[PDB]
Design a protein around this ligand. Structure first.
Ligand SMILES: Nc1nc2c(ncn2[C@@H]2O[C@H](COP(=O)(O)OP(=O)(O)OP(=O)(O)O)[C@@H](O)[C@H]2O)c(=O)[nH]1
Ligand SMILES: Nc1nc2c(ncn2[C@@H]2O[C@H](COP(=O)(O)OP(=O)(O)O)[C@@H](O)[C@H]2O)c(=O)[nH]1
Ligand SMILES: [Mg+2]
Lengths: 249, 269
């Protein structure tokens, strides 16, 4: 029972914090299995739906931080996706098959900087090379800094850009709210009612992870973990992996 | 009375909003806006110059740098900026050396650079190191944390201390400069301002209402920011530093440090 989740975004955008928030665990990145982007693979055991689940979070270092962020610089990410497909394919083709350990990536979270403006040329290029190989889920990182109106306007611009570039997002059989405006925090803070809640505390207010009125964190949690995890795994297996296999032959 | 201020930083760091908040008027639009097609077709940094008259009486050029860090390939991002700053010095030197000099030479030299850092808690990126190492030597560079309301107070402290160590690690000249001509009262003013550079700024051209009280800032599903509250952000210190306390020193150091250095290098080449 495995789940492999890829986080793509510039350093400091909030990837690790969001992972600790989603899985309600501060040790998600404790076991690391081992010119260009570097790939960090962390393995973790999380109980979900009452059963045990082997979580693998894949992370990037240095994405977007080079002078020239061309395809060569972030190609390690695509090679990692392909390699996990290639491992499954080799295991499937072995004569002495054994119960296959499934490392294929089941979702790619793409972390968009909260500019309020538009998707950058690098965001479009990367997402165009990935969406046929992973379930692509874009999110607006650190969305607490955005006004309610900026979120609406920014989401609209992003969606139109993705349509124009023919980038196909994951769609549950939620979708109208993509990209999700998310916040991250696995830390407890006191709010104005005196309650202990997960969130971030500033002189200008307290934002609450688990508050549906403050961000789309719960929509993302529903999509990844609580409601549609199996749909993510099935589209990886039945559609994306199968397209990759057939394209090799 | 001329004052030429440049803003440098990736699109959407609040550069145009900050300028408009500093001068309490809508001087400039965002250089790119919500339109990706507004990025320069040349795929390089371009200079965007606008001219303004404020009150005491003050003639201002605002120079924006659309395209800086916005493209896939940013390996020449700072060179049009460097070229523009140096061109202003070259123009002034040309005018100084003419035989029938103009009695009053117009000063188009860049007097201040607001350099916008992303509030990502990280050390200086390769892009910032390359641009800062060149810009700090030809203009008064004032670093600024863009959209600094990203950070809690604790994160702000950690980030500002990290950036100041980066400045020392690379030995950047960062405004304000101390000199032996300064009195003990002026050095202490410099020391206390320097301790909050990069400025943690929040910008806004809109007024919001908080308990009937109207001030300008930002209001959301969870947040209310008063831009003119020194307990919330450093906008008020930046404004006083730029426009009142160090305005004249910014103009003077442009002349007797940056332009004189440029001029001496030109006259021996
Ligand atoms: N404003 C805001 N800040 C956040 C949010 N989530 C995380 N941060 C902060 O942003 C900084 C980056 O957090 P990380 O979780 O380490 O981000 P990262 O993407 O893992 O970056 P790396 O250090 O390269 O691994 C930290 O100071 C976080 O506290 C958020 O939702 N809103
Ligand atoms: N959180 C936050 N948002 C800001 C701030 N200043 C501007 N914004 C918003 O951020 C977006 C981009 O700002 P803008 O001034 O156009 O950035 P520019 O492209 O660098 O000129 C706009 O939606 C602004 O309303 C700020 O200090 N904090
Ligand atoms: Mg991390």
């Amino acid at each position: 029972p495995s789940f492999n989740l890829l986080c793509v975004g510039p350093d400091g955008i909030g990837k690790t914090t969001l992972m600790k928030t989603l899985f309600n665990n501060d040790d998600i990145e404790a076991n690391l299995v081992k010119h260009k982007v570097k790939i960090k693979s962390y393995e973790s055991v999380i109980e979900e739906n009452g059963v045990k689940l082997n979580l693998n979070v894949i992370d990037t270092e240095g994405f977007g931080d080079f002078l020239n962020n061309d395809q060569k610089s972030w190609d390690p990410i695509i090679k990692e996706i392909d390699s996990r497909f290639d491992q499954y394919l080799d295991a499937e083709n072995k004569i002495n098959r054994h119960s296959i350990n499934d490392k294929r990536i089941h979702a790619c979270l793409y972390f968009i900087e909260p500019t309020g403006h538009y998707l950058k040329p690098l965001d479009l290029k990367f997402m165009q090379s990935v969406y046929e190989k992973c379930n692509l889920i874009p999110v607006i990182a650190k969305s607490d800094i955005l006004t309610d109106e900026e979120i609406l306007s920014f989401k609209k611009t992003i969606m139109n850009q993705l349509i124009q570039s023919n980038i196909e997002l994951f769609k549950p059989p939620l979708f109208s709210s993509l990209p999700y405006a998310v916040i991250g925090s696995n830390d407890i803070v006191e709010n104005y009612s005196g309650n202990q809640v997960r969130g971030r505390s500033y002189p200008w207010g307290v934002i609450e992870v688990d508050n549906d009125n403050h961000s789309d964190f719960n929509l993302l949690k529903n999509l990844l973990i609580k409601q549609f995890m199996e749909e993510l795994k099935e589209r990886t297996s039945k559609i994306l992996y199968e397209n990759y296999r057939s394209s090799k032959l | 009375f001329q004052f030429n201020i440049m803003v440098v930083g990736q699109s959407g760091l609040g550069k145009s909003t900050l300028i408009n908040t500093l001068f309490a008027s809508h001087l400039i639009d965002s250089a790119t806006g919500d339109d990706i097609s507004a990025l320069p077709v040349t795929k390089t940094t371009e200079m965007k110059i606008s001219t303004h008259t404020l009150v005491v009486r003050l003639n201002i050029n605002v120079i924006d740098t659309p395209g800086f860090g916005d493209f896939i390939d940013n390996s020449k991002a700072w060179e049009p900026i460097v070229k523009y700053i140096k061109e202003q010095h070259s123009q002034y030197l040309r005018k100084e050396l003419t035989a029938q000099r103009e009695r009053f030479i117009t000063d188009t030299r860049v007097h201040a650079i607001l350099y916008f850092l992303q509030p990502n808690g990280k050390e200086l990126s390769r892009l910032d190191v390359e641009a800062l190492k060149r810009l700090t030597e030809i203009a008064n560079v004032i670093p600024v944390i863009g959209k600094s309301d990203t950070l809690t107070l604790d994160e702000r402290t950690e980030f500002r201390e990290l950036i100041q160590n980066e400045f020392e690690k690379y030995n950047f000249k960062i405004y304000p400069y101390d000199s032996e001509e300064l009195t003990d009262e002026e050095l202490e003013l410099n020391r206390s301002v320097r301790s909050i550079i990069p400025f943690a700024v929040v910008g806004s051209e809109n007024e919001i209402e908080i308990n009937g009280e109207t001030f300008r800032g930002r209001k959301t599903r969870w947040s209310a920011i008063n831009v003119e509250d020194i307990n919330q952000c450093d906008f008020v210190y930046l404004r006083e530093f730029l426009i009142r306390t160090h305005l004249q020193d910014l103009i003077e150091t442009t002349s007797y440090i940056h332009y004189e250095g440029f001029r001496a290098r030109q006259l021996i080449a």
